[PDB]
Structure to design on (1524 residues):
């Protein structure tokens, strides 16, 4: 989610992702914790017997039979965490997420309530105004010629600098705004 | 702020204008493939894979998280067909043909067996229910000026 | 060996069952790298314009306008009378009309005849 | 009838002698007062008509259309106040003059005891609409749209004129009362078939008929908000009113000649409702929905039964109000986002809740939710069609299902989901827009209490 | 003066006052939900009076109070029918809604828009009462569409969630498919009987033809989620648990069945429509119980249970036993509403967890939910002398003692067994074993709102069957004599269901793993019906809507025929006409030609 993606997944990453998926689906099949622990230890053992293979062609012929076997026995109704992209409360609270700029449209009678909040908001806005001018130059000088190759951003280098393009990551609404 | 050169145009014939079209849509020349040059007005527009938006990565930080789209990336011709509100093409645990055979087979069997059960109904070892006054002639339809044939009920 | 999954139009092939990902080449790797480069350049432009405090409007999207223009206004200048196009247009634009005309004409002729013989039982038919 | 015509004419010198910053206020107030005065035409008779003079007469088919026409002008002014802010006083006065002239021509058209006078005013309405579309439209396609909206109309209307004069050369009169009382059957002849076609095609093109509907999406999409409102609410109903008037001389030839138009409408309602499901523009979707509703009205008029006519009148009024409201909602979104692409601005419920309620109620009336007058007209037409032939129920039910589908698709796409992040200029809804929305929607829910006011002369 | 009419109208009228005050100050405070709950409870205790009056005498009314438009010989008026069905169903619905609102005061406490949620619930209740008491077809259609719109609004309660909006549109689509048949029936009745009022429809239809009854059956199948149009009911579990408990469990989904109960005088005169109803109910109950016995979401299991019970109800209708189906509606209301009470309590205590694989030992961890769910499961499966017994046992006896399909009877018995099976599945996987939830335990039942709301429906699920069965007058001849085994068939099949399903569940503890079979996959993916039928038709519609209608015909060929052809022809003719080089030699040559031609042709 947070981390920038790469151009490809290496063989180790594919094997680890298959390991996690197979373990989760085995947990879906093996409801009870003791049965799951036994079968998960067996599953880890079955991964471990080819840990030390040196032939890349052999290792790539493997993981392929393995993912085919996974797709055969994948528990068509796996357990999903409620907040996960398949869960029952995945995007439940998106309707409560209001952008921060909407507060700029509030009536002065509305801003009369909560004066400290809006004073701190003004401070944040001033900080953003200055930091942006610094950030544009820093990103222009740090980016390689011909454009970025990976969507990874640099941190601040000097004392008073702020990380480039920070406003919409720092000012997220909330996980559960209401 | 879009100029005339940035709009879709006619079907490209030469590799030079093919490269120009690929550059226009912000995608590789090797990946660019227009729709076949038929009578349809597809013209110069990329034929992206027919995969739905639902099977795009949900953990990526999209610029449009609900639609799972990025800002400048080319939009599929049938985007409004695949919006996670509509038909999706995600891989299923069972093959499409297997599901079709199973669903069709189950429905056909149930339908066939209902017809068979109509042919061979189930009942109890009883005679018809009897009603006293000429099979309730006056309470069912009436016409009290006709004097229908008397139906006599047997005592057993 | 296990039963094989057969992809379809509406049930596509999984990414982990795709033979193309298991067949790696330097050309494939550079293709992936430059696809990521295009995506990163677009993302950088979007975020640079998105985080700007001076911006007070919709961020113009050329891809969306290209999509809408292709869907609406690019159709006819790219149209050619073709056997496929001509037959499809004739069928899908005439056949339903004549089919429904035949159906309704037959139904109404049957109704009119039955009224002529009087064997319709139009009793209590007051509102029409 | 002059007690309504003269104030509408006086709207012009009052507009042109007004202060530079009082034109909207004066126009709105006096147009509302004219609407209130015109509201007294609704006291109709069970007998013939309200025959004011040799020139003008009122009918319980004409009265609802007249009242809707008078009510539409204040709403059009309120909708136009926003996007005409940066324009000179003379040009704004000219725009208001075009609206007033359109209202005057429509008012005189709906009474119009003479068929030639009806034709003259029915074609005089063409000029103000064309000027409004081709002068105060935004995109470059407006000119093209205007051309379509022109020539289609004339392509239908020029033969009618010939037919009309021909009738008066044979009958001796074109007065509607004399025509109705002295009507005679049309023999099945080629000359009579072509007279029938010349009488029908002019009104068919402006409904519009399914095959002849190309001008409508262009004209409605490229027109300004007042132009779209007047096009969808009143100008589309001129064809229905003309058909309802003119089918009295076309019997019994209508029985045979109605079949191609009946098939075209019954299939085109399905086609246009399906087109609405795949639309990337809000205005185009609303225009195609209008085409579907008018196809249903065409079926009703062609069946020519009492229930058909009542349903057609009710549906014309209800569609006018609902389509005007929908266009106003789309324009409120457009004046903020400047794009008119449905997929761009999303999740507007979280930012504009009251406007979301207005969207919901407009979609509900477009969906024909009972006991709205939309469903009253829908059901009356459907029952009449079922009596005409029991197989129409398949097409009618399919149209109902697709209508609900695309109405809720339009609501969900624009109001629900997640807001677009990069759009930060969505300002709170103005009192003017909310007042406009209420002034559209309260008349509908209040007319459902007294349906006989909009059920026509066969009630 | 004969308070029956005044009180039966005052109930529905006072149900609408909080909707009037929805713009007042109380709607902006936190006392609005309690206000709505109190109003509903007062409505219930006031509607208890016409029930007593009918039970004493059998009193019946038609109240045609307001005359709306008149259509030549057809008069449409606001008329209420206050028969046994209305005066019996209204108190049950009000009691269930009262419990639902008291439960929602605790379940939806953290929702920022709770006043709105309560307002939505009251609007649904009002539309349902309009549907139930309607005397003509137009009023009943008003209620029919109102409950559907309220369902659409309440399913998509969390409008930022894509799946909720998709489910709401799905419900609308299926209910419009049913609406087609509703409108067909209305048009037929108006054209043939000249009325939409029930009295004239019954008087003029001694032998009802196929079209109106088939339209009624299609509408009932759409609204009660029968096999052809079933998936929307399980999909509707996207809404908040109170919405699932009130609308899509006990009150709204029975409406279709209610319609066939309302038109039972015409159903008994038709033989083919009865067979169609019986077969549809049998296949629905079998298929839904089969889907239920393998689900992992608890709300999905209870929704499939609701669908199976609706299928059983329409089986009862198809065997020409409408009053028995109404009684089953009344009992199912109680115990299925309490079942969703318990499910929602479990979900709330375990931090919005709905999967039974993560619900472990709750028999002791939360005991009141445990006992309420045990009682509800016993009432559902059919336990002698409980609320569900007095309906389900008679349903089974009537099906066995009738001239019916053999296949439908077999499927009804199998559905009873599978009902026992999914009940024991829920109990076994949610309450019996070791805990399987995350380590931080936030389990709590100690809130008087939840306890009282559950216990009222608990007392209902224990005693209401006995009370109602002994208080209503007899409306059918009973089955006094039966074979000894055939009287026991319901208990036998239910106990077999418990024993076999429990034995198969106990094998999950074995340290052995195998891959699933074809039948398990078919049961888990719902016969693959939601996959295929939500991918093949929709796509094939939407694609066409862009390829043929939008592009091929509208944007290409309709343009090519009329306008483009005219433009091309006029263009070419203008080019030919105006292209003269300006040489007067050619001009006067044409003049000679025309002059020569003119003299010769005319004379
Ligand atoms: C049911 C009985 C009601 C009795 C009480 C009287 C109610 C009078 C209402 C009159 C019409 C309302 C005006 C429309 C604009 C709304 C104004 C507004 O913005 O609200 C601000 C106000 C303040 O809220 P807020 O917090 O500031 O705003 C936050 C957001 O706006 C968020 O706000 P929200 O989320 O709360 O949504 C606003 C609300 C309100 O917005 C709406 O959607 C209202 C319009 C819905 C109708 C859509 C058109 C379909 C055709 C129906 C025609 C019926 C009209 C009958 C005659 C009316 C006379 C004018 O929408 C809904 O809640 C959805 C309700 C869906 C109802 C569908 C069922 C229709 C048929 C019902 C039966 C009708 C015939 C019965 C025959 C048998 C019995 C005699 O909210 C309200 O006051 C709510 C309005 C009342 C709810 C209306 C629901 C039922 C009323 C139907 C019409 C009258 C029935 C007559 C029978 C009486 C017996
Ligand atoms: C003969 C009556 C026994 C019914 C069949 C029970 C059985 O052996 O299923 C296991 C067996 C294989 O189970 P599996 O593939 O290893 O499931 C993986 C785990 O068990 C995964 O297990 P799970 O925890 O995910 O779900 C457990 C569920 C999953 O098991 C299933 O897949 C159920 C599918 C077939 C059962 C429905 C029968 C209708 O099984 C059950 O809930 C119990 C099955 C229902 C038995 C109780 C009522 C059935 C008796 C009705 C007929 C006899 C009474 C006549 C009254 C008049 O199913 C079959 O071999 C099909 C036999 C009949 C197909 C025709
Ligand atoms: C915010 C939350 C709610 C708060 C408010 C609570 C109160 C709600 C009550 C209001 C709605 C409930 C419906 C109950 C209706 C009661 C009044 C009704 O019965 O009167 C109607 C009367 O009203 C009219 O019939 C309908 C009004 C007509 C609408 C005209 C539109 C206004 C002009 C605007 C311009 C036109 C634009 C559209 C062009 C077509 C019907 O009466 P009717 O039995 O029949 O005869 C009248 C009396 N008689 C017997 C003496 C003759
Ligand atoms: C494109 C978008 C929509 C635009 C509007 C479309 C609607 C226009 C449709 C016109 C309505 C019907 C026209 C003619 C109807 C007459 C009945 C005819 O169809 O049936 C047969 C007619 O036979 C043949 O049709 C004879 C004419 C054959 C030539 C016609 C050309 C066929 C295709 C042309 C269609 C093109 C339409 C657009 C033109 C630009 C019966 O033969 P018969 O019983 O003995 O004679 C009946 C007539 N009598 C009694 C007066 C003598
Ligand atoms: C008749 C129907 C004709 C075909 C209608 C096509 C409509 C196309 C437009 C619909 C809009 C798009 C859409 O609905 O998306 C599909 C949407 C979402 O899919 P989910 O499975 O919920 O995915 C959730 C997880 N992502 O699902 C749907 O609603 C599709 C529903 C289509 C229904 C078609 C099948 C109906 C067949 C019924 C036949 C039986 C009739 C009943 C018999 C009655 C006898 C008494
Ligand atoms: C409120 C507080 C004030 C209390 C004092 C008043 C006490 C009651 C005295 C009222 C006087 C009697 C009265 O109302 O007159 C009758 C009058 C009807 O007018 P009539 O001309 O007599 O007949 C109708 C056709 N012309 O009755 C009324 O209007 C009052 C009650 C009407 C019924 C309630 C209507 C509610 C629903 C609104 C309409 C919904 C849409 C239509 C649905 C169609 C269904 C088929
Ligand atoms: C026999 C004669 C019959 C005469 C019928 C005349 C119908 C009216 C339309 C005539 C169009 C003639 C003009 C023309 O086609 O030129 C092509 C012209 C070139 O563009 P220009 O404006 O000239 O240049 C601007 C850019 N440099 O193309 C266009 O612009 C076309 C735009 C207008 C299209 C309007 C189509 C209206 C026709 C609809 C169908 C009915 C046609 C009328 C006859 C009905 C059948 C009996
Ligand atoms: C949207 C674009 C549509 C363009 C117009 C479509 C309508 C076409 C209708 C016909 C146009 C002219 C009809 C004449 C007007 C009525 C006059 C009349 O009825 O008199 C007839 C005259 O009938 C005619 O002359 C008709 C001749 C038509 C010639 C023009 C043909 C135009 C195209 C024909 C094919 C298409 C017809 C229908 C097209 C519908 C629109 C698509 C009989 O009178 P007499 O002959 O004096 O008495 C009989 C004893 N002698």
């Amino acid at each position: 989610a947070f981390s920038a993606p790469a151009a490809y997944l290496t063989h180790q990453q594919k094997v680890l992702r298959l390991y996690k998926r197979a373990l989760r689906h085995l947990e879906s099949w093996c409801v009870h914790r003791d049965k799951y622990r036994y079968f998960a230890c067996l599953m880890r053992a079955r991964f471990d017997e080819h840990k030390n293979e040196k032939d890349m062609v052999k290792a790539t012929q493997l993981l392929r039979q393995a993912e085919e076997e996974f797709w055969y026995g994948q528990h068509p109704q796996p357990y999903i965490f409620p907040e996960s992209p398949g869960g029952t409360s995945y995007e439940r609270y998106e309707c409560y997420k209001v952008p921060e700029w909407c507060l700029d449209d509030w009536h002065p009678s509305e801003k009369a309530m909560y004066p400290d909040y809006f004073a701190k908001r003004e401070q944040w806005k001033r900080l953003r105004r200055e930091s942006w001018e610094r950030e544009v130059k820093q990103l222009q000088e740090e980016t390689p010629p011909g454009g970025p190759r990976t969507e990874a951003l640099p941190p601040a280098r000097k004392e008073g600098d702020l990380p480039p393009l920070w406003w919409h990551i720092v000012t997220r609404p909330r996980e559960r705004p209401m | 702020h879009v100029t005339k050169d940035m709009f879709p145009g006619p079907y490209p014939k030469t590799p030079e204008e093919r490269a120009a079209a690929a550059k226009k849509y912000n995608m590789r020349v090797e990946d660019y493939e227009p729709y076949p040059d038929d009578g349809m007005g597809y013209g110069d527009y990329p034929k992206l894979p027919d995969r739905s938006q639902q099977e795009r990565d949900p953990w990526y930080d999209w610029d449009h998280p609900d639609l799972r789209l990025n800002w400048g990336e080319p939009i599929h011709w049938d985007l409004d067909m695949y919006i996670r509100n509509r038909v999706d093409t995600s891989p299923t645990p069972v093959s499409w043909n297997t599901m079709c055979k199973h669903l069709f087979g189950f429905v056909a069997f149930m339908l066939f067996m209902f017809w068979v059960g109509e042919i061979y109904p189930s009942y109890q070892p009883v005679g018809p229910k009897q009603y006293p006054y000429n099979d309730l002639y006056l309470e069912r339809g009436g016409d009290p000026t006709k004097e229908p044939e008397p139906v006599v009920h047997y005592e057993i | 060996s296990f039963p094989k999954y057969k992809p379809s139009r509406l049930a596509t092939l999984p990414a982990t069952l795709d033979p193309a990902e298991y067949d790696i080449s330097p050309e494939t790797r550079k293709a992936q790298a430059e696809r990521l480069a295009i995506r990163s350049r677009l993302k950088r432009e979007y975020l640079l314009q998105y985080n700007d405090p001076n911006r007070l409007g919709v961020i113009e999207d050329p891809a969306l306008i290209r999509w809408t223009y292709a869907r609406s206004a690019n159709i006819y200048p790219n149209f050619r009378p073709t056997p496929k196009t001509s037959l499809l247009g004739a069928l899908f634009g005439i056949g339903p009309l004549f089919f429904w005309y035949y159906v309704f004409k037959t139904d109404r002729d049957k109704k009119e005849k039955l009224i002529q013989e009087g064997k319709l039982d139009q009793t209590f038919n007051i509102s029409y | 009838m002059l007690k309504i015509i003269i104030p509408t004419t006086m709207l012009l010198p009052m507009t042109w002698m007004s202060k530079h910053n009082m034109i909207w206020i004066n126009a709105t107030v006096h147009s509302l007062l004219i609407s209130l005065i015109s509201l007294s035409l609704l006291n109709q008779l069970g007998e013939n008509s309200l025959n004011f003079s040799l020139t003008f007469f009122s009918d319980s088919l004409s009265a609802p259309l007249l009242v809707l026409t008078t009510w539409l002008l204040p709403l059009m002014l309120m909708a136009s106040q926003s996007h005409l802010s940066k324009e000179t006083t003379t040009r704004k006065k000219l725009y208001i003059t075009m609206l007033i002239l359109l209202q005057l021509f429509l008012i005189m058209t709906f009474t119009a005891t003479e068929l030639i006078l009806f034709y003259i005013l029915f074609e005089a309405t063409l000029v103000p609409t064309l000027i409004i579309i081709t002068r105060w439209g935004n995109q470059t396609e407006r000119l093209n749209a205007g051309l379509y909206f022109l020539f289609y109309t004339l392509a239908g209307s020029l033969p009618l004129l010939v037919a009309l004069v021909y009738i008066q050369n044979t009958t001796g009169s074109l007065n509607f009362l004399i025509i109705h009382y002295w009507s005679h059957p049309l023999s099945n002849s080629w000359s009579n078939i072509f007279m029938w076609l010349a009488c029908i095609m002019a009104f068919m093109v402006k409904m519009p008929l399914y095959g002849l509907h190309l001008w409508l999406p262009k004209a409605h999409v490229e027109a300004p908000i007042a132009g779209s409102m007047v096009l969808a609410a009143v100008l589309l109903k001129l064809g229905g009113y003309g058909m309802m008037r003119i089918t009295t001389i076309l019997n019994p030839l209508t029985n045979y000649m109605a079949y191609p138009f009946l098939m075209l409408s019954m299939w085109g309602m399905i086609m246009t409702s399906s087109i609405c499901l795949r639309q990337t523009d809000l205005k185009s979707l609303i225009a195609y929905s209008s085409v579907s509703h008018m196809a249903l009205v065409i079926v009703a008029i062609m069946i020519q039964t009492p229930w058909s006519f009542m349903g057609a009148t009710a549906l014309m009024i209800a569609h006018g109000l609902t389509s005007s409201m929908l266009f106003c909602l789309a324009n409120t979104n457009y004046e903020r986002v400047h794009s008119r692409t449905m997929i761009l601005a999303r999740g507007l419920q979280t930012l504009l809740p009251l406007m979301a309620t207005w969207w919901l109620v407009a979609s509900l009336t477009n969906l024909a939710l009972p006991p709205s007058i939309n469903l009253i007209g829908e059901l009356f037409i459907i029952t009449a069609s079922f009596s005409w032939s029991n197989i129409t129920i398949i097409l009618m039910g399919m149209n109902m299902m697709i209508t609900a589908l695309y109405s809720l698709y339009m609501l969900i796409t624009t109001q629900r989901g997640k807001y677009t992040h990069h759009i930060n200029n969505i300002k709170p809804s103005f009192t003017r827009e909310n007042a406009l929305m209420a002034l559209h929607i309260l008349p509908l829910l209040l007319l459902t209490l007294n349906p006989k006011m909009i059920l026509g002369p066969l009630y | 003066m004969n308070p029956f009419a005044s009180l039966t109208l005052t109930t529905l009228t006072i149900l609408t006052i909080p909707i009037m005050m929805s713009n007042s100050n109380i709607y902006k405070t936190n006392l609005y939900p309690n206000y709505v709950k109190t109003t509903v409870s007062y409505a219930f205790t006031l509607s208890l009076v016409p029930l007593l009056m009918f039970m004493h005498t059998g009193q019946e009314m038609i109240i045609s109070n307001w005359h709306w438009m008149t259509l030549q010989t057809v008069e449409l008026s606001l008329s209420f029918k206050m028969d046994y069905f209305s005066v019996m169903f209204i108190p049950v619905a009000l009691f269930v809604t009262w419990s639902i609102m008291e439960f929602s005061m605790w379940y939806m406490h953290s929702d920022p828009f709770i006043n709105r949620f309560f307002k939505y619930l009251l609007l649904f209740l009002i539309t349902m009462m309009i549907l139930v008491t309607a005397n003509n077809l137009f009023q009943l259609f008003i209620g029919w569409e109102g409950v559907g719109i309220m369902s659409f609004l309440l399913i998509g309660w969390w409008h930022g969630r894509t799946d909720a909006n998709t489910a709401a549109l799905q419900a609308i689509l299926y209910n419009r498919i049913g609406d087609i048949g509703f409108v067909l029936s209305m048009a037929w009745f108006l054209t043939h009987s000249n009325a939409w009022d029930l009295q004239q429809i019954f008087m003029l239809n001694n032998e009802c033809p196929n079209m109106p009854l088939i339209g009624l059956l299609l509408a009932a199948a759409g609204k009660s989620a029968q096999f052809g149009l079933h998936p929307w009911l399980p999909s509707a579990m996207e809404g908040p648990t109170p919405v699932s408990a009130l609308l899509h469990s006990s009150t709204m989904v029975v409406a279709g069945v209610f319609l066939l109960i309302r038109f039972y005088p015409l159903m008994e005169t038709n033989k083919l429509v009865q067979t169609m109803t019986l077969c549809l109910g049998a296949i629905t109950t079998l298929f839904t119980a089969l889907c239920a016995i393998t689900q992992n979401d608890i709300k999905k299991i209870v929704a499939f249970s609701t669908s199976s019970q609706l299928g059983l109800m329409m089986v009862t209708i198809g065997i020409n036993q409408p009053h028995l189906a109404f009684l089953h509606i009344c009992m199912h209301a109680f115990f299925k509403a309490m079942l969703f009470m318990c499910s929602g309590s479990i979900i709330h205590s375990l931090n919005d967890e709905q999967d039974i694989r993560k619900m472990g030992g709750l028999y002791k961890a939360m005991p009141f939910t445990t006992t309420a769910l045990i009682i509800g499961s016993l009432a559902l499966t059919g336990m002698p002398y409980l609320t569900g017994f007095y309906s389900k046992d008679l349903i089974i006896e009537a099906v066995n003692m009738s001239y019916t399909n053999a296949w439908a009877l077999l499927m009804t018995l199998i559905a009873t067994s599978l009902t026992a099976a999914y009940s024991t599945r829920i109990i076994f996987f949610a309450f019996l074993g070791k805990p399987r939830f995350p380590p931080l335990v936030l389990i709590n039942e100690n809130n008087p709102l939840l306890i009282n709301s559950i216990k009222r429906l608990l007392i209902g699920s224990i005693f209401a069957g006995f009370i109602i069965s002994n208080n209503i007058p007899p409306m059918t001849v009973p089955n006094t004599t039966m074979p000894l085994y055939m009287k026991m068939t319901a208990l036998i099949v239910t106990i077999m269901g418990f024993m076999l399903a429990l034995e198969l569940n106990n094998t999950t503890y074995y340290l052995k793993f195998k891959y699933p079979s074809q039948t398990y996959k078919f049961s888990n993916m719902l016969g693959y019906y939601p996959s295929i039928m939500h991918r093949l038709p929709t796509y094939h519609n939407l694609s066409m809507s862009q390829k043929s209608a939008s592009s091929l015909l509208d944007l290409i060929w309709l343009e090519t025929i009329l306008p483009k052809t005219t433009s091309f022809i006029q263009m070419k003719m203008s080019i030919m006409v105006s292209n003269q080089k300006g040489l007067i030699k050619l001009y006067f040559l044409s003049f000679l030609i025309t002059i020569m031609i003119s003299m010769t042709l005319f004379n």
